[PDB]
Design a binder for this molecule. Structure first.
Ligand code: ANP
Ligand code: ANP
Ligand code: ANP
Ligand code: ANP
Ligand code: N0R
Ligand code: N0R
Ligand code: MG
Ligand code: MG
Ligand code: MG
Ligand code: MG
Lengths: 352, 352
C-alpha cells in the first residue's frame, strides 16, 4: 500500500516515497495502523536511525502521481545498512532497481507477502530523469549549468531548459560510472563506463588520508593543492607544450610528483585528497568528452552521488568540458542527481 | 662528432648512440682522445655511474645509418640525474627531444660549443617507430602481439608485420599518456591524452605500499590480488549485470572496496600494488579503445616505458582490448618501446 521506489546501489540505497496529501476522512478512518505508523515515521523524522537521511530540500510538494496528489520524498542510507532496513521491515509492492535488487532479492522476500519487482538500473535512471525534469522542481528548473565556467569571478549556477532533451549523454557517477546515449524516451544505449568512479575517490582518499566519510574527504580536498602531488606539463617542459596546445598548468601525470621520496614526505593529506578528487573528476570528464564526440551529442548531463555537496567537482567538470572541447560541449547538472533510479522504479508501479 | 639522439622525458632520459664499426686505419689515427674515450666508456660498460643502464639486448648490430655501418645502442637514466650527465659532459651536435629539451636547454648550453637542436617529442616518436620497424630488430620482427590473449594456456607472444603501418593508433605510456592517430609518415594528430599514466602507477604505488622502485612495484603487483581492493560487478549484483553484458568479474569501482575500514585493515601491500596496476592499465586500454573507434583505426600499438619488463600490463591490455572490442581491435607492442623518441631525434641529425 505505501508507494516506494528503491535503488539499491553498490554504495548507497536511494528511496523515493510518495506521501498522499489528499487522504479523505473515510480513507483516514479505514487505514491500518501500520500504514499510519510508517507515514508518520517517515514524515516526522529527517534522520532515520543512525545512518538514514531525508533530503528535505529535494521534496516535490503537491505532485500529482497515479491520479493522487502528494509529496515526493527522497531518502538515502548506506547499502551496508540494508539489513537494518529489512529487519525494521519485518517488525507492499516494492519496485526495486540497482544491483542490490538482484543481490538482495532473497532478503527482501523475508518480509512476508511483500512483492518484489526488479527493474533495470539504467532504464529506471532514464525514466526518472525525464520524469523529474518534466514535472519541474516545484516550478524551478531541475537542470542547471555553470555560466562562464572559464572565469571564476563570473562562474555561476544558472537554470537550463531540457524540454526537448534528446539526444542526451547521461554520465552516471556512482560507485562506478556508466555513460548512456539517450536518443528518445525508449531508445538509449550504454556507450561505455569507467571503473574510476565515486568509489575510487572515496576508497583512495580513505587509504591516503585516513578520512572516515565522503564529506570529510571533500573538506580535506577543499583545503588542498593538487599540484603538490601531480606532475604538470610545466614540470616536464618548463612551460606550455605549445606545438599541441597543452597549457603548462595541465596535469601530465596524476600523482606523478609522488615518485620522489622527499615530495611524498612533504605532501599533506589535504593535498592528496584534492589530487584524488581532481584525478577522478578529470578522467570522468575526459571519457564523457570522448563519448559525446563519438556519439555526436553536445549536451552532457552528470548525475550520481559523487557530485552530492561537491561543487568543486561540478565546477571542474564545467570548466574542463568547455575548455578541452573548445566550447563545443556543455556540462549539465540536475538537482535530484542521485535519486533518478529510485523515481524510475516508483514509476513502474502501475505495471504490476 | 659522436652521434647521439636524446629524449628527456618527465621521468626518464633515453639516449640512442650510434657506434661506428667501419672506422678506417686513418680515421683511428686521426681521432681525438676524447672521442676515443667516450666510445670506449659507452661500449665497455653496461652500467654508467649508479643509475645509467645500457639495454644491451636491444642493440641493433651492423646498422647502416647516414652511410656508415655501426651498432645502435640504447641507454637510459633518470631525468633527476641529468645534472650528473651534464657535469660529466663538461669534464657535438645534440638532437634532443621530450619536454626536457626545452626545460634544460640552458643547462645543455653550459657544455662549451655544444649545439643543441630541439625536436618535437611526438614527431620524434613517430619517426623513430617507423624507422626501427623498417630496419627490423636484427632480422626479427620489431612488432609483436599476444595470440589467443583470451586464454592463458594459449596466450603467447607472436611477431606481427607492420610493413604497411598506416593507419595506426600509437599509445605512448610515459609519465603521462599521449595518443596519436598516424595516417602517413608525415600526417598524424594527437587525438587526446590521459594523465593517468606510468607516473600515476609509480606515484600511487609508492604512497600506498612504500615501494622504492618501479621494479619493486611490479614485483609486489605480481603477488597481489586486485579484487581485494576493487569492487566488482558481482559485488554489486551478486553476479553478472546481464542486460548490458557486463561480466561479474568486471571491475565496477577501482579501489571501491577500500571504503570499508575493515577491508582497508586486511588488504596487503601486494594487493594494493596490483589494484593500482590493473586500474591504470584498464583505463589506458579503455581510452585507447574509445580513440580507435572514433578514429576508425583497428591497430593500436602501445609504447613507452610503463610497459618495460611489465608482461602483466601487456597481457592485460591484449586481453582487455580484444574482449571489450569484441575482437575488433588488436593490441600491438614493440621491442624498443621506450626508445623511439631518442631514435627519431638522432634521425634529425642530417638537417643540421
Ligand atoms: N510467467 C508467469 N506466469 C504466471 N505465474 C508466474 C509466472 N512466472 C512466475 N510466476 C509465479 O508467480 C510468482 C511471482 O512472479 P513475478 O510477478 O514474476 O514476481 P517476481 O519474480 O517475484 N519479481 P520480478 O520478476 O522482478 O518482477 C513466482 O514466484 C511464480 O510462483
Ligand atoms: N554519504 C555518502 N556515503 C558514501 N558515499 C557518498 C555519500 N555521499 C556521496 N557519496 C558519493 O556518492 C558515490 C555513490 O553514488 P551513487 O550514485 O549513490 O552510487 P551507487 O548507486 O550506490 N553505486 P552503483 O551501483 O555503481 O550505481 C560514492 O562513491 C561517493 O563518491
Ligand atoms: N634564422 C636565423 N638565421 C641565422 N642565424 C640565426 C637564426 N636564428 C638564430 N640564429 C643565430 O644562430 C644561433 C643558433 O641558432 P639555431 O640553429 O636555431 O640553434 P638553437 O636555437 O640553439 N637550437 P634549435 O632552435 O632547437 O634548433 C642562435 O643563437 C642565433 O645567434
Ligand atoms: N627504471 C624506471 N624508473 C622509473 N620509471 C620506470 C622505470 N622503468 C619503467 N618505468 C615506467 O616508465 C614510465 C616512464 O616512461 P617513459 O616513456 O620513459 O616516460 P617519460 O618520457 O620519462 N615521460 P613523458 O614526459 O610523459 O613522455 C614511468 O612512469 C614508470 O611507470
Ligand atoms: O557501477 C555500476 C552499477 O551497475 N556498474 C558498472 C560501472 C562501471 C563499469 C566499468 C565499465 O563499464 N568499463 C570499464 C572497463 N572497460 C574497458 C576496460 C578495458 C578496455 Cl580495453 N576497454 N574497456 C569497459 C567499460 C562496470 C559496471
Ligand atoms: O606526458 C607528456 C609528455 O609531453 N604529456 C602529456 C600527457 C598527458 C596529458 C593529459 C592530456 O592530454 N589530457 C588529460 C586531460 N584531458 C581532459 C580533461 C578533462 C576533459 Cl573534460 N577533457 N580532457 C585532456 C587530455 C598532457 C600532457
Ligand atoms: Mg547507482
Ligand atoms: Mg520473476
Ligand atoms: Mg616520453
Ligand atoms: Mg633556435
Amino acid at each position: 500500500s505505501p508507494w516506494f521506489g528503491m535503488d539499491i546501489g553498490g554504495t548507497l540505497v536511494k528511496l523515493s516515497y510518495f506521501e498522499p496529501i489528499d487522504i479523505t476522512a473515510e480513507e483516514e478512518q479505514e487505514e491500518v495502523e501500520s500504514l499510519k505508523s510508517i507515514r508518520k515515521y517517515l514524515t516526522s523524522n529527517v534522520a532515520y536511525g543512525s545512518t538514514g537521511i531525508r533530503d528535505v530540500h529535494l521534496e516535490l510538494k503537491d505532485l500529482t502521481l497515479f491520479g493522487r496528489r502528494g509529496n515526493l520524498h527522497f531518502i538515502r542510507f548506506p547499502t551496508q545498512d540494508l539489513p537494518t532496513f529489512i529487519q525494521m521491515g519485518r517488525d507492499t509492492v516494492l519496485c526495486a532497481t540497482g544491483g542490490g535488487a538482484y543481490k538482495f532479492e532473497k532478503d527482501f522476500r523475508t518480509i512476508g507477502n511483500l512483492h518484489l519487482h526488479k527493474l533495470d538500473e539504467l532504464d529506471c535512471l532514464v525514466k526518472g530523469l525525464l520524469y523529474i525534469d518534466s514535472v519541474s522542481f516545484n516550478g524551478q528548473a531541475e537542470c542547471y549549468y555553470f555560466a562562464n565556467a572559464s572565469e571564476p569571478e563570473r562562474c555561476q549556477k544558472m537554470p537550463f531548459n531540457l524540454d526537448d532533451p534528446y539526444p542526451l549523454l547521461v554520465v552516471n557517477i556512482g560507485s562506478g560510472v556508466s555513460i548512456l546515449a539517450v536518443h528518445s524516451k525508449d531508445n538509449y544505449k550504454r556507450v561505455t563506463g569507467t571503473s574510476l568512479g565515486g568509489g575510487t575517490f572515496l576508497g583512495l582518499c580513505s587509504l591516503l588520508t585516513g578520512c572516515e566519510s565522503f564529506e570529510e574527504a571533500l573538506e580535506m580536498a577543499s583545503k588542498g593543492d593538487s599540484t603538490q602531488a601531480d606532475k604538470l606539463v610545466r614540470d616536464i617542459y618548463g612551460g606550455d607544450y605549445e606545438r599541441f596546445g597543452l597549457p603548462g598548468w595541465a596535469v601530465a601525470s596524476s600523482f606523478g610528483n609522488m615518485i620522489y621520496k622527499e615530495k611524498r614526505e612533504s605532501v599533506s593529506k589535504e593535498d592528496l585528497a584534492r589530487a584524488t578528487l581532481v584525478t577522478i573528476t578529470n578522467n570522468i570528464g575526459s571519457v564523457a568528452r570522448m563519448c559525446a564526440v563519438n556519439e555526436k551529442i553536445n549536451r552532457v548531463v552528470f548525475v550520481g552521488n559523487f557530485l552530492r555537496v561537491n561543487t568543486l567537482s561540478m565546477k571542474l567538470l564545467a570548466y574542463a568540458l568547455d575548455y578541452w572541447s573548445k566550447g563545443q560541449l556543455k556540462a549539465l547538472f540536475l538537482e535530484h542527481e542521485g535519486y533518478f533510479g529510485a523515481v524510475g522504479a516508483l514509476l513502474g508501479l502501475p505495471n504490476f
